[PDB]
């Protein structure tokens, strides 16, 4: 019988049950097919050995299926079953790969999804020394420090090395007296035979809105050992799985006045919960008319604005960040700046682009750069990342652009035309990288945009900042009767099917694909097709109270040139999307004009450009 | 080189392992793991690898290559020692000389590189050899990035009795193979990778014919022809006659300038006029 | 963290690229129970990057008849138009000469330039160029330009922060948006271009820092 | 740590406090802000650093709320319809079947306020609440409605707020001049014991799913009206500070009272010129009740009579149907339905949104705070909150007609000499 009248901790520590368990795990490791006749732990061990990973995953449900007794012994006394399983998986691998001894000679078995997902505030004393699965954000991480694993001292009076004691993570190891000269004294470590292991400490805390309903959020410690270190960064959402181990602290006893012990989770498996084939895309891109079909895929709810849909779609995929051969460092980021009276779904345009995009971040304007911060766990005064370095390759969604402060304004402009920040702070003098595309929305002064003045008046923004934006869309309002029904019906219906009684699959994988497998080229047949427009329009604008299309608009137009290389996979400049580039670069300029000039320039060009 | 960058570039294990398709790149990983070679020592230069690994490397590699279908892994060559640190295999001198004479960037007449390669064979010039080993590296890392193009894009046309390919200028590192002498080796490695790659039974026994542009101003390309590949190929090529008779039939402009006959310079416009008559001629 | 020794000391300067060969080891001065510190004991160091015959390509170029324009043509390839704004910049790279009259009343040895006009990004290119092609040069939009007196957290007292114009020794400093700089900072840069040194007399600080650099300013 | 309750404070004294020690399965019964009632033993505790000095400590064994609103023991229609004692359930049914209910809750909630019949209705529809929805993408529609009052001096503004905050359970009351930004929303405090920065909950958080009563809303500073808008928009509260990064929920409904610029409300200007709120905030309310004290001699008799009656009848002059304890029960019950919209009601709604825009049409008249889309998403909410009141499970034309009449009387026409 594999269950007799002892304590589960001490049943498994006996020689008989130990050997029985040892042999029982091998038979499961070697012979376990999964719904197709595949020895899963034959290919999985292989894929582990083709990378030198020394970490094997054991899904718990199958262990319970093929093994009824071990999957009940496990979360009772896991400080020894997870040790026996190690020596089992070793002898398996050293049979499937008899030379693997030259790679780390030690295997750890992780365990995946115990069936007992739990909260972080409901851990009571019942769970001391029991395997546990939890969840929550991580809010700190020290550096990867090396810790003793098999220490070995040396005596100071005999030149003899003491015994190889093992280090347990509750109390400093204590060597006795030298068995060679009885020289009991202050020994020192022997850096050459001692074995070390990585080490990292993190402070996990409850998820923001998940369980912290009407109270404050609790937290816990965790200790990631050798293979696990740097599995997670401050801000990630993870789900631990680890022994919940306590240890005596002398400080808490002197604050609370009672004998009180500290607790810590010795993590055993960390699995993040976040956000991480062409043959269709070939013909789907070769439709020759993917433009219309993609425009009405973003902005899924909000009706109208197929104008600004165009610009934002241009922005999303981006353009081409070519490096000029004259050391001029032209940028390949499209920055947008919405504006319009309150109540026109600007903020929703920001929030949906938060979702559809990847590696995106978000902020309000009412933290932009790295700042000195006292770490929650480590208690050292480190430096933490801001809000323009977390979009170092993706997008930065600014909200309430007007409410920025003078320091914030003098810091935002630097990153536009240089895309690189220096920090000579109290911490240390560094110069980091920031390559992000800015998507922001300002407000009209006086509670309403009025197009008698130029746009540079109702925006309430410093003038050399608006130049750092490529597109200038102006949102407004309408009282047209036939569209009142169109918008009403839509909203009402969207309130009928949301309550407890190109889709979002093509374009996400498409912004993943089309981001990568294209590199648009630049010929020189368009080089003269545009100047014929500039020579005219410069005079046309300077004639009146306005400043014509200047070089910082030609740059935006030439950037949006490639903005369609990502949608069509075209990647070759043609006189077709130049009709589009010029069209857009004037679209974002006629609106930001005067009362009668916004229409005089229209009567000229909107009929001239042959839209 | 390192032990890793020389498995990914020998055009005999870069074919079997199929080190151009992510599906079979793990084969290399498994091959390394079956020997106990840490993935951190294999990536470092060979002279700095630990001394405890390299004891019987040349045997634990021949063995663990039987388990993968590569039984011709040891060859018979010679090696030379001069002094304290000078140790050459007779197929390193060759790849260094062969790449001092065919360096892409040209610095004068046709006989300016010849002299610099004739120089690097005497022991009083170990500073050119030791330099012509950084070109031979740069070349070998810019060949598996072309045979990776014409096999993840299928630019090997089965034009009938022989395969066929061609190159594009826009692809990077295609002006390196502009010379009419450094093009034969690229084709002869392309055939070796192909024959191992394709699933057919016909294409695996057809000779290849390749063309790449020579001169943009004259608008001409260079063309070669290589025998049908196999393990025991007699190596008796037959294109010096085919191209001659084809240019004779079409009556186009050709140049048999070199000493070997199977390399020709052809007008960019007479390409198809030549090729169709050749297809009919070989039949 | 490194640990240099007898002849490796004072061999590298903050801002260098190196290649260290060291013995990864642990401090033995005898968060967690058995944690140690770790450093790299350096025992090999490297650094990543005038002639008689080179002198002649300077000699003949200085002697050739049209020596003036040949430089002022190849100092702004991208931006074109109005070579005067490039003619002048040629002089600032060389500068006059520092004279000491009998009275020790020295004279300037540098020049200052203002490029007024709208910010149209045509000038940022020029700033970047003149900064890149300078023996010493800094382009600024942190601590500030001139010196400051800041309450140190540790000392709880005021300490002195020499800004950019004290680090640029003989070099050239480029500035844009001449109305954005802090009021105090603009006052101090005015005095620094006036006297060519910065002397702050505040809470516990009475020092002098010689500012020897060149101002290339761009207005709006 | 517990602090002396309010009703025990001797006058002119700062409240004392002591440490209680929960030591069992009772370990997270008491949370911050609650008014529990502990029952254990008082013990003495040494100073263990020198093991003297002793200090008192309470060693609780049981903890329970001080006054249970339902004396049984302390979440859908059936879980609650189980605890309903026979009289409770035969009364809630009687009310739900009552006709003219929508006029016997006003007359029974505010019994000492003559007039403003269009403000009590709005306050009720605010108390009942709309239907909170979550879009599939991950966003969320606001479910509860916000209400602002603006009027002449001494027009019973602070009286509506005091009524609501003393009636409702879990509803907080704050003025505007004596608040902060980090006091309303959420703070960050250094606990040197743990020597860490932790989060403190604010007035907009410890009133969650209740009502926050802000009096004198336009006295708050410029930067303190920003943090409140960042919460009123997304219904959440972000924190990004020393070592803290978090996002907290806030599903409160705000009832705010303000004063026009320069004392009196000038009826020849738009709203944006009569009040000094920001521009964004005035968009996030979607119910305004401009009060104007056009000194009517007939009222100045009525109000006089009512006040002198109340002051001659200390505890009387408050006789109304549906006693206040009962309405709490009816309101805890009827706040667990999720009424739906029938197709005819949807057609009615879109037609009403048609008939509202064009009133603001050009030429004939003019009005203030021009009508937009956000007024529509705020008409379905009022209809849902009206349907909840009659305990039904669907919206009918009978509800939307009234929810439109109310929102129609809300907006007034600007005038000119
Ligand atoms: Zn000893």
Q: CA A320, CA A331: separation in Å to the nearest integer?
A: 8
Instruction: Identify the CA nearest to B210 among candidates B228, B190, B194.
Output: B190
Q: CA A544, CA D364: separation in Å to the nearest integer?
A: 37
Q: CA C70, CA C61: separation in Å to the nearest integer?
A: 9
Residue with tokens 């738009």: D270
Surface of A (462-501) touching C: CB under 8 A: 464, 467
Chain-centroid distance, C-alpha D238: 21
Q: CA C145, CA C143: separation in Å to the nearest integer?
A: 7
Q: CA C131, CA C140: separation in Å to the nearest integer?
A: 10
Nearest C-alpha in C relative to A148:
C34
Residues of D in contact with A495 (CB under 8 A): 133, 141, 341, 377, 380
CA dihedral A577, A582, A587, A590 (to 10 degrees): -170
- CB atoms < 10 A from the CB of A169, how many? 15
Q: CA A342, CA D370: separation in Å to the nearest integer?
A: 11
Q: Resolution in A, one decimal?
A: 6.8
Q: Does the beta carbon of D59 lie under 8 angstroms from any beta carbon of chain A?
A: no
The DSSP secondary-structure symbol of C47 reads B
Chain-centroid distance, C-alpha C131: 9
What's the Cα-to-Cα distance from B150 to each of B147, B190, B191, B222, B224, rounded to whole Å?
Answer: 5, 8, 11, 18, 17
Helix (H, G, I), strand (E, B) or coil at A569: coil
> How, if at all, do strands A381-384 and A371-374 pair?
antiparallel
Instruction: Identify the CA nearest to A118 among candidates A83, A80, A75, A82.
Output: A75
- CB atoms < 10 A from the CB of A240, how many? 26
| A-to-D residue pairs, Cβ atoms closer than 8 angstroms | 136
Provide φ and ψ at A337, rounded to 5°: -145, 100
Q: CA B145, CA B123: separation in Å to the nearest integer?
A: 34
Nearest C-alpha in B relative to A520:
B170
Q: Which residues pair with D341 in a beta bridge?
A: D395
What's the Cα-to-Cα distance from D184 to each of A145, A605, C120, D172, D286, rounded to whole Å?
Answer: 42, 53, 45, 11, 22
Contact state of D341 with A489 under an 8 Å Cβ cutoff: no
Q: CA D168, CA D186: separation in Å to the nearest integer?
A: 23
Write out A194-225 in H/E/C secondary structure: CEEECCEEEEEECCCCCCCCCCCCCEEEEEEC
Q: CA A137, CA A232: separation in Å to the nearest integer?
A: 10
Q: CA A486, CA A278: separation in Å to the nearest integer?
A: 37
Helix (H, G, I), strand (E, B) or coil at B209: strand
Provide φ and ψ at A200, rounded to 5°: -160, 145
Mark out the alpha helices in A31-186 (DSSP H runs). 40-49, 60-66, 70-73, 78-96
Mark out the alpha helices in A337-495 (DSSP H runs). 346-356, 406-417, 455-458, 463-466, 481-494
∠ CA A7-A9-A14, rounded to 5°: 90
CA dihedral A46, A48, A49, A50 (to 10 degrees): 90
Cα(A495) to centroid(ligand 1), Å:
82
Are A338 and A438 spatial neighbours (Cβ–Cβ below 8 Å)? no
∠ CA C124-C128-C133, rounded to 5°: 150
Tokens of A551: 């070089």
Helix (H, G, I), strand (E, B) or coil at D171: strand
Helix (H, G, I), strand (E, B) or coil at C45: coil
Longest dimension (CA), chain B: 66
Q: Where chain B is broken, by preceding residue (C–N > 2.5 Å)?
A: none
Q: CA A116, CA A129: separation in Å to the nearest integer?
A: 15
Contact state of D32 with A215 under an 8 Å Cβ cutoff: yes
Distance of residue A101 Cα from the nearest chain B Cα, in angstroms: 7
Are C178 and C215 spatial neighbours (Cβ–Cβ below 8 Å)? no
The DSSP secondary-structure symbol of C51 reads -
Tokens of A367: 């933290």
A348 is in an annotated binding site: yes
Q: What is the CA radius of gyration of chain D?
A: 24
∠ CA A68-A74-A80, rounded to 5°: 130
- Euclidean distance between the first and final Cα of chain B, in Å? 46
Conformational region of residue A51, where left means phi above 0, alpha means psi within -120 to 50, and beta covers everything else: alpha
Residues of C in contact with A417 (CB under 8 A): 121, 124
Instruction: Identify the CA nearest to A264 among candidates A249, A250, A279.
Output: A249
Listing DSSP states for D93-154 in one string gives HHHHH-SSHHHHTHHHHSTT--S-HHHHHHHHHHHH-------TTS-----S--EEEEESSS
Instruction: Identify the CA nearest to D17 among candidates D2, D28, D31, D27.
Output: D2
Tokens of D358: 């064009």
Instruction: Identify the CA nearest to B28 among candidates B40, B14, B38, B41.
Output: B14
Q: Which chains touch A (3 or more CB pairs under 8 A)?
A: B, C, D
Q: Which residues pair with B79 in a beta bridge?
A: B89
Cβ-in-10-Å burial (0-12, 13-18, 19+) of A598 comes to: middle
∠ CA C209-C211-C216, rounded to 5°: 155
Cα(A188) to centroid(ligand 1), Å:
12
Q: Which residues pair with B264 in a beta bridge?
A: B223
What's the Cα-to-Cα distance from B272 to each of A349, B268, B276, B281, rounded to whole Å?
Answer: 55, 9, 6, 14
Helix (H) or strand (E) holding C124: helix C122-132
Contact state of A102 with B38 under an 8 Å Cβ cutoff: yes
Helix (H, G, I), strand (E, B) or coil at C151: strand
Surface of B (43-102) touching A: CB under 8 A: 53, 60
Burial C93-132 (b: 16+ CB within 10 A, else e): beeeeeeeeeeeeeeeebbebebeeeeebbbbbbbbbbbe
Q: CA A63, CA A28: separation in Å to the nearest integer?
A: 8
Contact state of A374 with D242 under an 8 Å Cβ cutoff: yes
In chain A, which residues touch B (CB < 8 A)? 46-47, 49-52, 97, 99-103, 521
Q: Which residues pair with A477 in a beta bridge?
A: none
Helix (H) or strand (E) holding A589: helix A577-590
Are A373 and A380 spatial neighbours (Cβ–Cβ below 8 Å)? no
Q: CA D51, CA D54: separation in Å to the nearest integer?
A: 12
Helix (H) or strand (E) holding A140: strand A136-141
Nearest C-alpha in C relative to A551:
C120
- CB atoms < 10 A from the CB of C37, how many? 11
Q: Does the beta carbon of A96 lie under 8 angstroms from any beta carbon of chain C?
A: no
Do D and C touch, counting CB pairs below 8 Å (3 needed)?
no
Instruction: Identify the CA nearest to A562 among candidates A497, A518, A512, A500.
Output: A518
Q: Does the beta carbon of A550 lie under 8 angstroms from any beta carbon of chain C?
A: yes
Contact state of B53 with A102 under an 8 Å Cβ cutoff: yes
Helix (H, G, I), strand (E, B) or coil at C71: helix
Q: CA D291, CA D153: separation in Å to the nearest integer?
A: 9
- CB atoms < 10 A from the CB of B251, how many? 10
- CB atoms < 10 A from the CB of D8, how many? 8
Cβ neighbours of residue D89 closer than 8 Å, sequence gap 6 or more: D81
- CB atoms < 10 A from the CB of A518, how many? 18
- CB atoms < 10 A from the CB of D191, how many? 9
Q: Where chain D is broken, by preceding residue (C–N > 2.5 Å)?
A: 51, 74
Tokens of A521: 């080229």
Q: CA B152, CA A35: separation in Å to the nearest integer?
A: 34
∠ CA A398-A517-A50, rounded to 5°: 100
Cβ neighbours of residue D283 closer than 8 Å, sequence gap 6 or more: A342, A343, D372, D374
> How, if at all, do strands B79-81 and B87-89 pair?
antiparallel
Nearest C-alpha in A relative to B34:
A97
Q: Does the beta carbon of B168 lie under 8 angstroms from any beta carbon of chain A?
A: no
Cβ neighbours of residue A305 closer than 8 Å, sequence gap 6 or more: A299, A345, A475
Burial D151-184 (b: 16+ CB within 10 A, else e): bbeebbbbebbebbbebbeebbbbebeebebbbb
Distance of residue A405 Cα from the nearest chain D Cα, in angstroms: 12
Are D336 and D391 spatial neighbours (Cβ–Cβ below 8 Å)? no
What's the Cα-to-Cα distance from D389 to each of A205, D102, D329, D350, rounded to whole Å?
Answer: 40, 8, 13, 23
Nearest C-alpha in C relative to A141:
C31
Q: Which residues pair with C25 in a beta bridge?
A: C39
Cβ neighbours of residue C141 closer than 8 Å, sequence gap 6 or more: A410, A414, C176, C177, C180
Helix A40-49 / helix A78-96 crossing angle, nearest 10 deg: 80
Nearest C-alpha in A relative to C151:
A426
What's the Cα-to-Cα distance from D53 to each of A253, A300, D21, D56, rounded to whole Å?
Answer: 16, 69, 19, 10
Are C117 and C123 spatial neighbours (Cβ–Cβ below 8 Å)? yes
Q: Does the beta carbon of A492 lie under 8 angstroms from any beta carbon of chain D?
A: yes
Are D200 and D188 spatial neighbours (Cβ–Cβ below 8 Å)? yes
Distance of residue B32 Cα from the nearest chain A Cα, in angstroms: 7
Contact state of A479 with D358 under an 8 Å Cβ cutoff: yes
Q: CA A63, CA A79: separation in Å to the nearest integer?
A: 18
């Amino acid at each position: 019988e594999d269950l007799k009248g002892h304590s589960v901790r001490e049943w498994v520590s006996m020689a008989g049950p130990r050997l029985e368990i040892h042999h029982r795990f091998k038979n499961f490791l070697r012979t376990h097919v999964d719904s197709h006749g595949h020895n899963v732990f034959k290919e999985r061990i292989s894929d582990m050995c083709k990378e030198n990973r020394e970490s094997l995953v054991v899904n718990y449900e199958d262990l319970a299926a093929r093994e009824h007794v071990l999957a009940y012994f496990l979360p009772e006394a896991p400080a020894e079953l997870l040790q026996i399983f190690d020596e089992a998986a070793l002898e398996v691998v050293l049979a499937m790969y008899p030379k693997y001894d030259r790679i780390t000679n030690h295997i750890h078995v992780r365990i995946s999804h115990l069936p007992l997902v739990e909260e972080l505030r409901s851990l009571r004393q019942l769970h001391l020394n029991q395997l546990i699965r939890t969840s929550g954000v991580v809010t700190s991480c020290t550096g990867v420090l090396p810790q003793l694993s098999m220490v070995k001292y040396n005596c100071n009076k005999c030149n003899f090395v003491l015994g190889p004691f093992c280090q347990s993570q509750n109390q400093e190891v204590k060597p006795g007296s030298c068995p060679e000269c009885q020289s009991a004294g202050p020994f020192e470590v022997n850096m050459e035979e001692t074995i070390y292991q990585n080490y990292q400490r993190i402070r996990i805390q409850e998820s923001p809105g998940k369980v912290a309903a009407g109270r404050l959020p609790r937290s816990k410690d965790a200790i990631l050992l050798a293979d696990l270190v740097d599995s997670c960064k401050p801000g990630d959402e993870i789900e631990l799985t680890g022994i919940y181990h306590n240890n005596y602290d002398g400080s808490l006893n002197t604050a609370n006045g009672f004998p009180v012990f500290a607790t810590v989770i010795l993590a055993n498996h960390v699995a993040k919960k976040d956000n991480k084939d062409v043959k269709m895309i070939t013909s789907l891109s070769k439709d020759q008319q993917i433009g219309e079909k993609i425009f009405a895929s973003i902005a899924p709810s909000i009706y109208g604005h197929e104008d600004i849909k165009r610009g934002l779609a241009l922005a999303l995929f981006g353009g081409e960040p070519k490096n000029p051969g004259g050391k001029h460092k032209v940028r390949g980021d499209i920055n947008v700046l919405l504006c319009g009276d309150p109540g026109t779904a600007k903020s929703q345009f920001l929030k949906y682009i938060e979702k559809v995009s990847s590696r995106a971040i978000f902020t309000t304007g009412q933290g932009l750069t790295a700042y000195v911060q006292r770490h929650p766990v480590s208690r050292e005064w480190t430096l933490e990342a801001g809000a323009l370095v977390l979009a170092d390759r993706g997008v930065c969604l600014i909200d309430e652009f007007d409410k920025m402060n003078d320091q914030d304004r003098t810091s935002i402009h630097e990153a536009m035309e240089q895309q690189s920040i220096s920090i000579s702070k109290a911490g240390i003098v560094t110069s980091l990288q920031a390559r992000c595309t800015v998507i922001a929305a300002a407000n009209p002064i006086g509670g309403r945009y009025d197009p008698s003045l130029t746009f540079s008046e109702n925006v309430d923004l410093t003038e050399p900042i608006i130049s750092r934006f490529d597109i200038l869309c102006v949102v407004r309002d309408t009282v047209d009767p036939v569209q009142d029904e169109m918008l009403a019906r839509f909203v009402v219906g969207s309130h009928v099917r949301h309550h407890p009684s190109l889709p979002q699959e093509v374009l996400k994988k498409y912004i993943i694909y089309a981001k990568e497998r294209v590199h648009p080229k630049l010929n020189q047949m368009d080089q003269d097709k545009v100047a014929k427009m500039y020579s005219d329009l410069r005079k046309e604008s300077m004639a009146t109270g306005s400043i014509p299309i200047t070089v910082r608009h030609i740059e935006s137009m030439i950037r949006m040139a490639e903005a369609h290389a990502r949608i069509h996979l075209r990647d070759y400049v043609i006189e077709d999307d130049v009709n589009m580039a010029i069209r857009v670069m004037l679209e974002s300029f006629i609106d930001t004009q005067k009362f009668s000039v916004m229409r005089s320039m229209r009567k000229t060009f909107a009929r001239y450009l042959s839209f | 080189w390192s032990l890793h960058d020389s498995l990914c570039n020998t055009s005999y294990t870069a074919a079997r392992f199929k080190l151009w398709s992510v599906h079979g790149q793990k084969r290399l990983q498994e091959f390394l793991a079956d020997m106990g070679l840490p993935l951190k020592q294999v990536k470092q230069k060979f002279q700095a690898m630990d001394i405890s690994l390299k004891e019987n490397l040349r045997e634990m590699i021949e063995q663990s290559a039987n388990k993968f279908g590569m039984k011709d892994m040891r060859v018979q060559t010679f090696s030379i020692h001069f002094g304290f640190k000078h140790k050459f295999l007779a197929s390193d001198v060759v790849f260094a000389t062969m790449s001092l004479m065919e360096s892409p960037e040209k610095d004068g007449s046709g006989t300016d590189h010849f002299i610099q390669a004739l120089d690097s064979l005497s022991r009083s010039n170990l500073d050119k050899l030791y330099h012509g080993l950084e070109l031979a590296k740069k070349q070998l890392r810019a060949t598996q990035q072309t045979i990776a193009s014409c096999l993840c894009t299928n630019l090997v046309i089965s034009q009938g009795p022989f395969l066929y390919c061609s190159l594009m200028e826009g692809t990077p590192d295609v002006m390196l193979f502009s010379r009419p002498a450094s093009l034969s080796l690229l084709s002869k490695h392309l055939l070796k990778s192909f024959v191992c790659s394709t699933k057919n039974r016909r294409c695996k026994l057809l000779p290849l014919v390749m063309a790449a542009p020579l001169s943009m101003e004259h608008g001409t390309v260079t063309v070669v022809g290589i025998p049908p590949e196999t393990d025991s190929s007699d190596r008796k090529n037959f294109f010096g006659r085919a191209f001659e008779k084809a240019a004779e039939s079409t009556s186009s402009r050709m140049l048999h300038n070199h000493f070997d006959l199977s390399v020709i310079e052809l007008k960019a416009e007479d390409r198809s006029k030549f090729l169709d008559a050749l297809i009919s001629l070989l039949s | 963290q490194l640990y240099c020794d007898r002849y490796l000391c004072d061999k590298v300067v903050p801002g260098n690229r190196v290649t260290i060969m060291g013995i990864y080891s642990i401090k033995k001065f005898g968060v967690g129970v058995g944690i140690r510190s770790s450093y790299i004991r350096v025992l090999g160091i490297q650094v990543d990057t005038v002639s008689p015959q080179e002198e002649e390509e300077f000699r003949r170029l200085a002697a050739l008849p049209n020596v003036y324009e040949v430089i002022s043509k190849s100092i702004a390839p991208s931006i074109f138009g109005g070579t005067d704004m490039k003619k002048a910049i040629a002089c600032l790279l060389f500068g006059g000469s520092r004279k000491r009259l009998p009275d020790g009343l020295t004279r300037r040895g540098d020049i200052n330039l203002l490029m007024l006009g709208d910010p149209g990004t045509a000038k940022s290119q020029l700033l970047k160029f003149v900064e890149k092609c300078s023996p010493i040069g800094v382009y600024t939009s942190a601590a500030g330009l001139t010196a400051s007196v800041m309450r140190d957290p540790s000392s709880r007292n005021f300490i002195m922060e020499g800004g950019a114009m004290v680090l640029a020794d003989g070099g050239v400093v480029c500035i844009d948006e001449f109305d954005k700089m802090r009021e105090d900072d603009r006052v101090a840069i005015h005095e620094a271009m006036e006297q060519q040194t910065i002397s702050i007399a505040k809470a516990g600080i009475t020092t002098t820092l010689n500012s020897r650099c060149s101002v290339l300013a761009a207005a709006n | 740590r517990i602090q002396e309750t309010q009703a025990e404070l001797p006058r002119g004294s700062i409240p004392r406090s002591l440490e209680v020690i929960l030591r069992a399965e009772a370990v997270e019964s008491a949370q911050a802000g609650d008014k529990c009632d502990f029952t254990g033993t008082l013990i003495v505790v040494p100073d263990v650093s020198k093991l003297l000095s002793y200090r008192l400590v309470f060693l609780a064994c049981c903890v329970a709320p001080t006054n249970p609103r339902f004396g049984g023991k302390e979440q859908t229609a059936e879980s609650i319809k189980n605890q309903m004692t026979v009289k409770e359930w035969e009364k809630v049914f009687e009310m739900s079947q009552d006709k003219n209910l929508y006029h016997n809750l006003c007359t029974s909630l505010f019994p000492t306020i003559h007039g403003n019949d269009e403000v009590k209705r709005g306050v009720l529809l605010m108390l009942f609440g709309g239907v909170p929805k979550t879009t599939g993408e991950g966003t969320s529609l606001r479910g509860d409605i916000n209400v602002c009052i603006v009027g002449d001096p001494s027009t019973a503004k602070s009286q509506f707020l005091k009524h609501v905050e003393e009636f409702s359970p879990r509803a907080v009351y704050t003025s505007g001049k004596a608040s902060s930004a980090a006091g309303l929303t959420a703070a960050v405090v250094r606990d040197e014991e743990s020597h860490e920065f932790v989060i403190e909950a604010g007035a907009l958080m410890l009133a969650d799913n209740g009502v926050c009563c802000i009096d004198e809303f336009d006295k708050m500073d410029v930067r303190d009206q920003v943090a409140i808008h960042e919460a009123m928009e997304q219904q959440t509260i972000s924190i990004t500070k020393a070592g803290v990064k978090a996002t907290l929920n806030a599903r409160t409904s705000i009832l705010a009272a303000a004063n026009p610029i320069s004392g009196h409300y000038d009826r020849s200007k738009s709203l944006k010129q009569n009040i000094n709120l920001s521009a964004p905030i005035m968009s996030r309310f979607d119910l305004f009740f401009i009060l104007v004290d056009e000194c009517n001699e007939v009222t100045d008799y009525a109000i006089a009579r009512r006040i002198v009656d109340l002051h001659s009848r200390i505890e009387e002059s408050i006789d109304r149907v549906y006693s206040l304890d009962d309405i709490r029960r009816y309101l805890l019950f009827a706040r667990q339905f999720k009424p739906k919209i029938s197709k005819e009601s949807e057609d009615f709604i879109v037609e009403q949104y048609k008939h509202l825009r064009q009133r603001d049409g050009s030429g004939v008249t003019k009005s203030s705070w021009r009508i937009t889309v956000r007024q529509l998403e705020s008409m379905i909410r009022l209809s849902e909150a009206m349907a909840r009141m009659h305990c039904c499970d669907e919206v009918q034309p009978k509800h939307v007609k009234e929810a439109f009449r109310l929102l129609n009387k809300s907006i007034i026409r600007v005038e000119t000499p």
